[PDB]
Point group: C3
Chain length 145, copies 3
Amino acid sequence: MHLKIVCLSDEVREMYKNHKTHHEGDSGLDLFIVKDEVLKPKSTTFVKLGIKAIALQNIVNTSFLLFPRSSISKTPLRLANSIGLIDAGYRGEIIAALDNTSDQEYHIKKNDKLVQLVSFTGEPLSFELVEELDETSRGEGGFGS
Amino acid sequence: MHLKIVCLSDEVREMYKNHDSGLDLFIVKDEVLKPKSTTFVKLGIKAIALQNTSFLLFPRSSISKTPLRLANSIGLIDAGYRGEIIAALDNTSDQEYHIKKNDKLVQLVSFTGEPLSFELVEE
Amino acid sequence: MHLKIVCLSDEVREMYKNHSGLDLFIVKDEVLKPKSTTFVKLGIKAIALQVNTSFLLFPRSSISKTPLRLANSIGLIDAGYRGEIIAALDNTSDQEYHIKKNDKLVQLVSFTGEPLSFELVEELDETSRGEGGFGS
Ligand SMILES: O=C(NCCO)[C@H](CCOC(c1ccccc1)(c1ccccc1)c1ccccc1)Cn1ccc(=O)[nH]c1=O
Ligand SMILES: O=C(NCCO)[C@H](CCOC(c1ccccc1)(c1ccccc1)c1ccccc1)Cn1ccc(=O)[nH]c1=O
Ligand SMILES: O=C(NCCO)[C@H](CCOC(c1ccccc1)(c1ccccc1)c1ccccc1)Cn1ccc(=O)[nH]c1=O
């Protein structure tokens, strides 16, 4: 599956240009937290990941999945919607709905990795950074803006 | 991915006559979920899938705004299952939570992630 | 999808010899603390063959009646992986919770959703992590 990713700021583009953390094989592509943020106790926060994305599998545009990373387990953070379903047609900012199950506020930091994108096939993924997803303003393409 | 769905009462029939990767399922009767609880919510339907195949029950994205969570994370509905479809919902709140006929909390989805089609059926 | 499973002790081998989703056993009695996440070791390593493929660890439906929930929602096991399989279990109760040898809380499933088979095998490949090769 091939992901095309629009970074919504230069600071995000800088994090994905220097990705680190993804290799040959890998069924999941880790996404970054892009800004320090405090999640309230006993709350759901809708955390914006600073990117938009489409997946391609003669080419079709496909739905894909947003999984928690394994290592989220050691934190009190849980993915509210279990596994996120990103539809083929979605062009908005990718967002993680994180339940803070603790009674203390929880600090997430720029460069933390809590979730990863995954293909319905389970096959290795690759990605490239792109200026737009399609011609629409929401896809960040087309005349003007 | 094609579903043949059997509705269980006529008023559920009506709901599904009156409707991309997932097919939203309706809450079929008003119900109060106790605080800190897990409730098995019957969805008024049985269903098979043709592509005879297994399929998945995901929470809908919008469940996140509520304090309800699917207890078994993602439901796995085996090719062999003929029973009514049931969502196990935890209410993570200290308060009761009311769910209404027509609420959409849960969706069916195929292992391929390809857009889904259904027909109502009676057997 | 075909799974090749190494049991990490003879006791575990006995359980899998006498056995869509393939259910995995709890292999030792253990007490989960209240309000906790525990990495429960399942005493097996496993590979899925189609060549090697990624696969998924779901909770079983019946986990819903307990207070135990899978902390990472659905586990993703990469094609590589040769480590012991672990279930990350949240005990959402304020009492300790007893799991027992033979309980079934979790299951392996394919990304295809195809029915699966397994055989018990002595090594996954030649490496030590695969339980293979010289010295084993
Ligand atoms: O299609 C969408 N949005 C359209 C723009 O609104 C989805 C997310 C649905 O948006 C949520 C939301 C919508 C309605 C009620 C409650 C929440 C959302 C839900 C769950 C996870 C992530 C996002 C949303 C939209 C905008 C701001 C905050 C939340 C995209 N999506 C789906 C799963 C997901 O995990 N992340 C994500 O971005
Ligand atoms: O085979 C099933 N049901 C009836 C046959 O026994 C499955 C789910 C298992 O049934 C539960 C249950 C079984 C054993 C202990 C506790 C609960 C169940 C669990 C989780 C989700 C939904 C249903 C069940 C069966 C009958 C009444 C209430 C719950 C089908 N299934 C699986 C996932 C799911 O999300 N919904 C569902 O209906
Ligand atoms: O690839 C792994 N381990 C390599 C050794 O690190 C996995 C899970 C990541 O390992 C955990 C862990 C790592 C880092 C921080 C916290 C936990 C883990 C997390 C979630 C579920 C199961 C295991 C781990 C590794 C070693 C001992 C205990 C936990 C394998 N995996 C993935 C999903 C899963 O559900 N079960 C599992 O065994």
